[PDB]
Design a protein around this ligand. Structure first.
Ligand code: HSE
Ligand code: HSE
Lengths: 367, 367
């Protein structure tokens, strides 16, 4: 009924009313979409690439109009790429709750004011329901494969587990069956830092001329450290000063200065309200809720999957991927991606991760 | 010339004018002190116990008047204990910059107003001058052993390296030769959260009936996570809710609630200004500064030392202890403490760490 945008261009997909897991019903849902490669005549070659916490639909490509920075996974989709677009059609949504096209706290409700504090808490499962609805509105009812890391891997997991009849294979990268105590710990506190900012104004700051920037920068600095590998950070920055500043007289250390920059980079492209809603959705992640626990749910999922984890990951430790490999019968065994870059390793080790993308897409073609 | 307090009792030791590494001078410095076990006639059996970031002079004993909670290393010193007070004199200060007896931002400056924003930045090396000044004020000019973990291990490494002829052995536990990028990263951001609180008031909140409690609570919650082990936390809390609260309708998870209490516990006994000043001193930690670098400094230190590190420590990883073991000729080899409790492991694994305390005092006997 509706059509994929032209390659590279964004389209907004009207999915209508959506009933969340909470029972609430959200009106006028809109999901931003982008694609690379041609949609095959059977519409059976879609590879959904699922972004992480602050990502959007712009997975690959250079900076341009409407896109201040290159794709967050630059190079993963294209001619000859791991997601080879001469044979596959890489589709990437902007997740429900986001702030780059899709319906989120920053978006305008049917009363003309921004959703703000009225946006309901949503789950990873809601986010997967929204994407499936959107692919439906475009006439795509089965996907060849899902690929994702971090939150995107959580989306991938809930996709393959909840819709096994409508996905042929999955690649789950640096993710676990549920939220860990440590993740919830850092993540709930990140939310607290934003909410403690006085300009938070209960989440209804949009269009007031004040925003919770101090809190959002705090959240991003602490979060960024979880994404890194301890040694690599020490090797890059150590206890060196930033340029010619002296910390003993109020200047900054190099790693400190860097973290500040990471926060400014986020402020110029991201909305505090979405940071809260999506982190809440991370906290609630649990593939076993309502289906007998993690083991029961995974043991029942027959979808073939490739599971990869990073050796140096401090936020989603390898043990969590081993658990997924252990429990999912469609998984041949854990694939260990060797990397010094911690959680961000799955975006950095392009060759090692490419192999997993190829094996994952190979499995979608066997069926 | 001044008196050792009674066993258990706090005493306040006037050390007078103290000149910091910056050249600045603080007048009327006071170091709170406590001791357990009897001081020998030669005054040669002192075992200095150095507390970590939030610690005080109350290393052992139960809660009582002036001590709302038992000592931070309850049990480490006593008859037959690792620090055997029938033979050793266990002395513990409150570090310069603290808020439990010694001169810190919360202390009253000579003008009758709190030091506050006027308290100067200090180093681990400064903290050691003040401790050495206090013991001198008591007629103690040489210690037998220095024992510490975390910030107290940096106080013990700067003591063994800077006062090499006035200490006979050292126990360096869960510490490194300098601050790591990761440590500086989390720690500067913790300071940033305190300073972003509106009630911080440039550090001069002390007599204004409002204080930066939200920021100090944010700092402690993030810090607390670094002291824990990822697995034990997940085993303890998982993604369980707190009691009967529903996070999907505004409730808290069990770990989230736990972290909230950790912050409440700190507020009722600790000063935000000291948190800031003391974290600065942590960032400035660098045993090689002014001595030609870490290797040069350690290679030149002949003091017998024991070095222990915790396998699961996420704030001061085992690699940092291996470096100390590698470089100090007085170290026979890294002693690895097996523990699932992360950084807090050195206070928990009482037999394993106590075993090492005995080894250190054993070395002080030999010498
Ligand atoms: N892309 C998300 C997750 C990164 O691992 C973010 O930047 O926060
Ligand atoms: N918990 C200690 C740090 C080392 O565990 C303190 O803050 O005093």
């Amino acid at each position: 009924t509706q059509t994929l945008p032209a390659e590279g261009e964004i389209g907004l997909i009207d999915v209508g009313s959506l009933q969340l897991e909470s029972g609430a019903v959200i009106d006028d849902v809109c999901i931003a979409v982008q694609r690379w490669g041609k949609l095959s005549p059977a519409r059976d070659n879609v590879v959904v690439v699922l972004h992480a916490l602050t990502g959007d639909s712009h997975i690959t490509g250079p900076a341009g109009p409407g896109h201040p920075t290159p794709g967050w996974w630059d190079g993963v989709a294209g001619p000859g790429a791991p997601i080879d677009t001469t044979r596959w059609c890489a589709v990437a949504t902007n997740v429900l709750g986001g702030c780059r096209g899709s319906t989120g706290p920053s978006s305008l409700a049917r009363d003309g004011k921004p959703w703000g504090s009225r946006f309901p808490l949503i789950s990873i499962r809601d986010q997967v329901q929204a994407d499936v609805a959107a692919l439906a509105a475009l006439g795509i009812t089965e996907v060849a494969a899902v690929v994702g890391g971090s939150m995107g891997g959580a989306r991938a997991l809930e996709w393959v587990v909840g819709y096994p009849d409508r996905v042929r294979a999955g690649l789950l990268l640096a993710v676990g069956a549920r939220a860990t105590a440590d993740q919830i710990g850092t993540q709930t506190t990140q939310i607290a830092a934003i909410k403690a900012d006085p300009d938070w104004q209960s989440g209804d700051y949009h269009e007031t001329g004040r925003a919770p920037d101090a809190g959002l920068r705090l959240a991003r600095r602490f979060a960024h450290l979880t994404y890194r590998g301890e040694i690599e950070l020490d090797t890059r920055f150590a206890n060196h000063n930033q340029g010619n500043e002296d910390p003993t007289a109020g200047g900054r250390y190099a790693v400190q200065s860097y973290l500040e920059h990471q926060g400014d980079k986020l402020l110029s492209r991201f909305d505090a309200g979405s940071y809260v809603i999506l982190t809440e959705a991370l906290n609630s992640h649990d593939v076993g809720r309502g289906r007998g626990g993690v083991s029961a749910a995974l043991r029942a999922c027959p979808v073939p999957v490739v599971v990869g984890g990073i050796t140096s990951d401090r936020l989603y430790p390898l043990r969590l991927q081993q658990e997924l490999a252990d429990l999912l019968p469609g998984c041949a065994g854990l694939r260990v991606v060797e990397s010094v870059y911690g959680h961000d390793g799955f975006l950095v080790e392009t060759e090692a991760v490419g192999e997993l993308i190829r094996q994952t897409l190979g499995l979608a073609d066997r069926e």
